[PDB]
Design a protein around this ligand. Structure first.
Ligand SMILES: Cc1cc2nc3c(=O)[nH]c(=O)nc-3n(C[C@H](O)[C@H](O)[C@H](O)COP(=O)(O)OP(=O)(O)OC[C@H]3O[C@@H](n4cnc5c(N)ncnc54)[C@H](O)[C@@H]3O)c2cc1C
Length: 411
C-alpha cells in the first residue's frame, strides 16, 4: 500500500483516512483543531445525512451513533406567503430509509481518536503554503480537505462552474431542547417563505443527547438577515423565536419551552457557493489535491455538503485503491475529481436553483406533490440522490411531461 497525507479532520478527510487505514495504507492527518477543541467549541453544521451517505459510513463500521441518534423519517415542505401567512400548498412524505444528523462536535472527535487507534498519525498544525510543501516532499499524495478554512482559497476558482460570487443566504443555526415532536413521523420541516428565506428543523444528536436543530436561511438584507446584530446566546435564541412567530407560526407552536442545548449550540454566518479547480500547484511545483468542500461548497441541507463529503470520500477511496502503485499524478487527480463532479454537478445545479426565485415549472412541480402523494414521495426521496431531479427539475417541457405521466397514472 501507500503513504497518504490528509489536511483537515472533517467529514471527508476522516472518512477517507479511516477507510484507508483499515485497508492497510499509512495515513498522516494534519488538522488545526484538537479533538477536545472540537468538542468544546461551537456547532459547525446541521449535518443531515441521508441514507446513501449514512450507508457509506455503515460499510466502514463508522456509524457509532446510529442507536443513539433520532431518525429523520421524512421531508415536509410548505410554501408560505409572508404577507398573510397563507400556505400556497404543503405536503410531507416518508423517506424510504431514514436520515440522521450527528453533531460534528460528537462525530469528529471520536473519529479522530478512532483514527489514532487505527494507527493513523495525527498532527495538530495550521497548514499554510509552507506546511503543504513539507507534506508534498514526504508523502506520495497530499489531500487538502480543509472545508471552509481559507487555505482552501489557494485552489483556483472555477468561473465556468461557479454561478455565484457572493453569499446567497444569511445562515443561522440554533440547537434546542424541548421542541415538540411531530407525529406520526419526524421530518425536515422545510418552509419556503416567499422573497424572505427558508426555515427548517429536524431532530439530531448533540453533545448532551437528542435535540432539534433550527435552521434559518435569509435572503440577504431581508427580514431574516438579522443575525449581524445578534451576539449573546440569549439574543440568538430570541431572534430565532421571533422569526418563527412572525413567519412560521405553526413551527413557533412547537417551541414554547425550547432552550439552547448548550452555550455553543448556535452559529451565524454566510459564505459564497463556489466551485474550484482540483489541483493546487505549489511554488516548488509539487501538487496538492483538493477534496469535498475545499472544491465544491454549497448552502445548507439542499447544498448537502455532509452528504457530498461522505460520497466524495467513497469515490476518492475507490480511486486511490484502483491506482495501485502508480503515481498520484495531476492527471489522476483531475480524473478522480471529475468522477466526483459527475455526481455533484446536478446536485449543485439543484441547490443553486433553490437560492433564486423558483422557475414557474418548479412551483408547479413542488405544488403537484401536495395533490399526488406519489410525487411527494419522489421529491422527498430524491434528497438521497438529487441527481434524480434531472431532467424535469430544469426543463419546463420535461416538467410537464413528468406531471402528465404522474397524473394520467393517477387516473
Ligand atoms: C450552517 C451550516 C449548516 C450545514 N447543514 C448541512 C446539512 O444539514 N446536511 C448536509 O449534508 N451538509 C450540511 N452542511 C455542510 C457540511 O457541514 C459541510 O459541507 C461538511 O462538513 C464538509 O465536510 P468536509 O470534509 O469537506 O470539511 P469539514 O467537515 O468542514 O472539516 C474540515 C477540517 O479542516 C480543518 N481545517 C481548516 N483549515 C485548516 C488548516 N489551515 N489546516 C488544517 N486543518 C484545517 C477544519 O478545522 C476541519 O477540521 C452545513 C454547513 C454549514 C456551514
Amino acid at each position: 500500500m501507500r503513504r497518504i497525507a490528509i489536511v483537515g479532520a472533517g467529514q471527508s478527510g476522516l472518512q477517507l483516512g479511516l477507510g484507508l487505514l483499515d485497508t492497510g495504507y499509512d495515513v498522516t492527518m494534519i488538522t488545526n483543531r484538537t479533538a477536545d477543541e472540537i468538542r468544546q467549541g461551537k456547532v459547525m453544521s446541521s449535518q443531515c445525512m441521508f441514507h446513501t451517505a449514512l450507508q457509506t459510513e455503515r460499510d466502514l463500521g463508522l456509524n457509532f451513533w446510529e442507536e443513539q441518534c433520532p431518525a429523520v423519517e421524512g421531508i415536509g415542505l410548505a410554501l408560505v406567503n409572508p404577507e398573510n401567512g397563507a400556505k400556497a400548498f404543503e405536503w410531507s412524505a416518508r423517506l424510504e430509509r431514514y436520515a440522521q444528523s450527528v453533531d460534528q462536535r460528537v462525530k469528529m472527535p471520536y473519529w479522530m481518536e478512532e483514527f489514532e487507534r487505527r494507527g493513523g498519525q495525527l498532527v495538530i498544525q495550521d497548514a499554510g503554503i509552507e506546511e503543504l510543501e513539507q507534506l508534498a516532499n514526504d508523502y506520495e499524495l497530499v489531500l487538502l480537505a480543509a472545508g471552509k478554512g481559507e487555505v482552501v482559497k489557494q485552489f483556483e476558482r472555477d468561473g465556468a462552474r461557479s454561478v455565484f460570487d457572493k453569499p446567497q443566504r444569511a445562515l443561522a443555526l440554533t440547537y434546542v431542547k424541548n421542541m415538540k415532536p411531530i407525529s406520526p413521523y419526524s421530518r425536515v420541516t422545510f418552509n419556503i417563505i416567499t422573497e424572505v428565506g427558508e426555515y427548517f428543523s429536524f431532530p439530531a444528536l448533540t453533545i448532551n443527547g437528542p435535540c432539534d436543530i433550527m435552521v434559518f436561511e435569509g435572503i440577504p438584507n431581508g427580514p431574516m438577515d438579522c443575525w449581524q446584530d445578534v451576539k449573546t446566546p440569549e439574543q440568538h435564541l430570541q431572534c430565532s423565536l421571533d422569526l418563527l412567530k412572525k413567519f412560521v407560526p405553526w413551527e413557533y407552536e412547537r417551541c414554547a419551552n425550547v432552550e439552547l442545548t448548550d452555550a455553543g449550540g448556535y452559529l451565524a454566518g454566510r459564505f459564497p457557493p463556489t466551485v474550484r479547480k482540483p489541483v493546487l500547484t505549489l511554488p516548488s511545483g509539487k501538487k496538492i489535491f483538493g477534496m469535498a468542500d475545499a472544491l465544491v461548497v454549497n448552502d445548507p441541507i439542499t447544498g448537502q455538503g455532509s452528504n457530498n463529503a461522505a460520497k466524495c470520500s467513497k469515490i476518492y477511496f475507490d480511486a486511490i485503491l484502483a491506482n495501485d502503485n502508480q503515481s498520484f499524478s495531476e492527471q489522476w487527480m483531475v480524473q478522480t475529481f471529475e468522477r466526483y463532479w459527475a455526481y455533484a454537478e446536478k446536485v449543485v445545479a439543484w441547490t443553486n436553483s433553490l437560492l433564486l426565485p423558483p422557475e414557474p415549472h418548479v412551483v408547479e412541480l413542488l405544488a403537484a406533490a401536495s395533490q399526488n402523494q406519489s410525487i411527494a414521495s419522489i421529491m422527498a426521496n430524491n434528497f438521497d440522490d438529487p441527481r434524480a431531479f434531472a431532467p424535469w427539475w430544469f426543463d419546463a417541457d420535461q416538467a410537464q411531461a413528468f406531471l402528465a405521466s404522474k397524473n394520467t397514472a393517477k387516473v
